[PDB]
Symmetry: C4
């Protein structure tokens, strides 16, 4: 929330634009926020709140909040401790942390921090390097493979093109790409016992097919407005997708979650959990690990506050809330 | 209307922000106004207006307007005569005045002013102190218990947190809290012969349950945008709630009523009456009792004008008006 | 269109505000324009336009345009020739001119100009003075009684109250008021052979009743936003009212007509004709009779242009156009 | 996109306004853009993209993109090489180029450039000169007659009227007009073996009739907001028209296409192809033939990018995408 100011001041111009930007005219980046702001929660009153809990069970493990840190590449771009600082704060907060394929610190090191790390996979031209990366994540103790499926190639980032931005010095520590298809998903699924989570699903029939394909979860997401410019916001497809999946997998959403109230809105629309991306990096650029820890602490307080004000003692009760679309 | 200027000039910055503010991003505070502005009345023409009357019967008593003063805590924050000045003006205007649990003058004193005072109850951790407070109100001649049900705890007021605002010197004159549940409502109901009015109802099924619970009224209200940020405006739920209650209790609404035309809109959507909060305090900060009296006089004129222009000789006719949603 | 600039420069501040203003917050004044701007016409192509005609038959007489000059009181406030200049220009343009009850020149004089004048009636406390005024209009050769039915009393004009505006010196030349009801309408109807036109109808059932009452026409109108603040715009009720009346009377609309395209939109929504008010007075304040004549000439050109671009050789074809609501 | 800056700087004021302007208040010019911005694409994931192709077959010929250059008159107003520079760049890009009746270079010369030129016909008062112009186009090797049907006469361009704009020196090189009707369309159809394409269709029943009339295509178009001011945008009618035509002719759309994402949106709504008008002239005014070539190259890249991000290996797959309307 606040922190974006501090992030801009301390970060170089091309780095902040890299983090904040979307593709094309940034129509989908802005729409993620406008879609959330149109959602109003209908709160329930007078229910027992003696033991409000924000915990959820997801992928076999208890999480402190219906929330995980979204995969964001090259976190040493924002702070010298990079991914290690975020993973430690996430571990301490009881929240899953998603290790990126393009992390600026190796996945084995991030995983050693503990917590329950997830691993985000970009498909490589080699089915063999891809499946080896999946094996590395699983050997390292990762709890889920978050297969990103909305990047056959990178969308056109006009901020980066204008800046002529390039990665200085930070490296892709996991390395000494190709478009993913449904065959690639089956290959991952056959190669791991970990739940496979498809990130970047927006069509109802792709959500149905993801369940048919054996996915343990999906992330309803337009990649923070960074891929197809003009792609519908995930929050706009979330309710339809939740109904179509009918409990067959976990349904996460991301894009523009900026408060505990937004988490409540996402769960009232039926999400299992949210991912949060840019705000975590603002906290990381502002004050390192302690900055992320404070963000997560504040988010946990706002989620708990919003849930109780809505009459929800549990996240499951929050998913049963009704909503109304407004202006 | 006008008066907000004068209130800001004469009040300290932290006091005005305390009065004007909402929770979080103030999404629900703003939505109360935007929702009302979208409502258009379809007026009726050529009806007898020989004896237009703005009076209503509510909770056994005649009121001059379909309107009461909303509970607003610590009114000595705005003027040295505090609650006593507002209660006198309300009495003289023929309008109910809602005494707050957190009044800066004792409820017995406010009630002595006369009129027909209502008493707003916040549940205390002791069922016994709560029911004693209800008994005090009833012994004092209060006509209704307005049980506030949307504050299990206070919402996060970011204006106050930024200001580091705190109550100076003004005190809670009724004292020498806990979340309310449906059991608390039953306890109040069993302990009083006065009508019990649940303030802060937004879900249709909570309105139905309130009637089943024996409530004599409800106030459809998001607490002026001060509790759940992102809670639907009451005006957006009013019509559905009125249909579901089917005359089983009085249905009041508050939030953003700023004119006689707004009162007409609320009654055309089916409200029995409105509450008005911040405008009454603007009048109180601007010119004390005489300022409130002028506000109520002007409001009575605007309500009467709006009703006649819409072809309504009575508030009941105003409730039968149709509306259209616009931009 | 343009002319409003010239009108403001030459007119006193309180006179321009008197002409431009609406009641209350001017919500309905602004909504008249926003409602029209949301309407999009679906044009037809490739039809014979060899003899495009903007003429209509209304109340037994041919008019050059589907348009009449709206009743606007005290036209000498805007130009020394006042109503006489407007009536002459309307006559020369082939357009009906509505003489006001509060005209600053007597109705017999305005009628002597020729053309086909209509007479707008405000009901007076005396049924006898009212019916005498109707007789004067009919003896004078007026073609229709435009009974204004949305002014039981004047709405609250906040511009005038702020200005402390008052009529200087201009007088009500017809004189040497009370609320109208359906009985008053019957009294007028029984007293005249002229068509009676009810101005200020917004509810579908008042339109039906107007036909049952023997009205020859209605004007769907919120009085240019000058009466009930928050009254629906006429253009928003026009289509429903046209369907309910099912050809039983002429249905005019006014409020915010500012171009030939707006006339086309009104006729595509089903109007028989429009009234135009403030623009005619801008032309009158800017350049007297010649200014009004130019306005009407330009309007006739824009109507003809818009009709041909939409594929309509006649106003009847324009009424059969479809529309789509937009943003 | 960018280029509009460069075009304004290098072009005279009255020439740029001539190119950019619309009729009346420019309501339909702006609505073309607002309508497109409201459309969101629902992308598909994980499909084979090994051979993404932006090619389409239209009017018997393969085109590199689902796109043609829109007819824009008097292109020497923007650059000394005028139409010849645009036609060469279109030929080199594999895109059809529409020769205007009012071209500032003769149609035989433009056609000699090669490519696959289309010819836009304005009906002349002589059926014989009109059909001779059609014969000239067909003898010259044009592939389609684009019969413009939404100009019985020119709409009222207020920018041009204010500027007192007139064609200097540039001439209508095809010459040494009348309103078109359905009889004129039949006359063209009987006189040519080329597909006849009706440009300027907005009503569903005119689209049906165009197919019944033997048209090979239609362009759903409000003429870039330059004809009827208040005409619905083509993009708003496109989906209904596509369903009504049920494959009976090609359905193109134009108006406000400003990116590859906009092309994707148009094809997802069912268009066969788009026309692009003003952007091509911005490129022509900025850098002549090389400027147009770069525009078309960039557009081809953006279309290909948008299609792959949406999971579409072919334009036919893009037409099967779903959309959602937003804010
Ligand atoms: C250059 O991007 C790239 O290489 O790939 O994208 C990721 N990196 C990445 C980098 C950056 C800087 C930002 C802002 C987002 C992403 N994201 C999107 C993120 O995961 C959320 O979907 C979104 O941020 C939530 O919205 P929010 O920020 O809270 O509003 C990535 N997602 C992947 O799956 N893999 C990645 O590497
Ligand atoms: C700090 O707040 C607090 O302690 O509890 O809230 C009350 N005090 C209170 C204090 C103040 C400063 C304001 C602005 C509102 C409330 N309100 C809400 C009010 O009753 C109307 O619902 C709303 O104001 C109508 O909207 P409007 O102003 O006309 O637009 C309260 N409601 C309760 O039930 N009890 C209270 O003590
Ligand atoms: C002070 O008003 C008053 O005394 O009564 O109102 C009238 N005088 C009158 C005066 C003035 C200054 C204006 C602006 C409107 C009216 N109007 C409304 C007008 O007839 C159109 O309905 C509206 O103007 C169309 O909208 P538009 O301007 O084109 O946007 C009147 N209507 C009556 O029936 N009788 C009147 O005397
Ligand atoms: C003065 O106009 C005139 O003489 O006739 O109009 C044309 N000339 C013409 C000239 C100019 C300057 C502009 C901007 C558009 C047109 N257009 C409209 C164009 O074909 C597209 O429909 C629209 O431009 C797409 O929208 P877009 O620009 O991409 O947003 C023409 N269409 C015809 O059929 N014949 C023409 O001669």
């Amino acid at each position: 929330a606040d922190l974006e100011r501090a992030a801009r001041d301390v970060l170089p111009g091309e780095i902040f634009d890299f983090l904040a930007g979307g593709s094309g005219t940034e129509a989908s980046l802005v729409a993620n926020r406008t879609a959330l702001e149109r959602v109003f929660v209908i709160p329930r009153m007078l229910r027992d709140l003696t033991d409000v809990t924000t915990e959820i069970d997801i992928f076999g493990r208890r999480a402190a909040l219906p929330m995980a840190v979204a995969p964001v590449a090259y976190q040493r771009l924002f702070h010298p401790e990079g991914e290690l600082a975020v993973a430690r704060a996430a571990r301490d907060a009881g929240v899953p942390y998603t290790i990126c394929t393009l992390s600026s610190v190796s996945l084995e090191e991030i995983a050693a921090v503990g917590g329950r790390p997830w691993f985000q996979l970009f498909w490589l031209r080699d089915e063999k390097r891809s499946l080896d990366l999946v094996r590395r994540a699983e050997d390292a103790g990762c709890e889920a493979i978050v297969f990103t499926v909305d990047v056959p190639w990178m969308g056109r980032r006009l901020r980066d093109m204008r800046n002529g931005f390039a990665l200085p010095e930070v490296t892709a520590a996991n390395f000494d790409f190709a478009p993913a298809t449904w065959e690639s998903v089956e290959a991952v699924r056959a190669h791991t016992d970990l739940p496979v989570v498809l990130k970047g699903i927006l069509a109802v029939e792709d959500a149905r097919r993801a369940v048919d394909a054996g996915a343990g979860g999906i992330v309803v997401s337009n990649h923070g407005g960074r891929q197809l410019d003009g792609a519908v916001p995930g929050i706009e497809m979330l309710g339809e997708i939740v109904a179509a999946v009918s409990g067959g997998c976990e349904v996460l959403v991301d894009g523009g979650i900026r408060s505990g109230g937004d988490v409540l809105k996402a769960t009232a629309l039926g999400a299992s959990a949210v991912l949060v991306g840019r705000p975590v990096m603002w906290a990381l650029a502002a004050a390192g690990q302690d900055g992320v820890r404070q963000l997560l602490e504040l988010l946990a307080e706002e989620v708990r506050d919003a849930m109780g004000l809505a009459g929800c003692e549990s996240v499951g009760a929050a998913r049963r809330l009704n909503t109304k679309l407004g202006v």
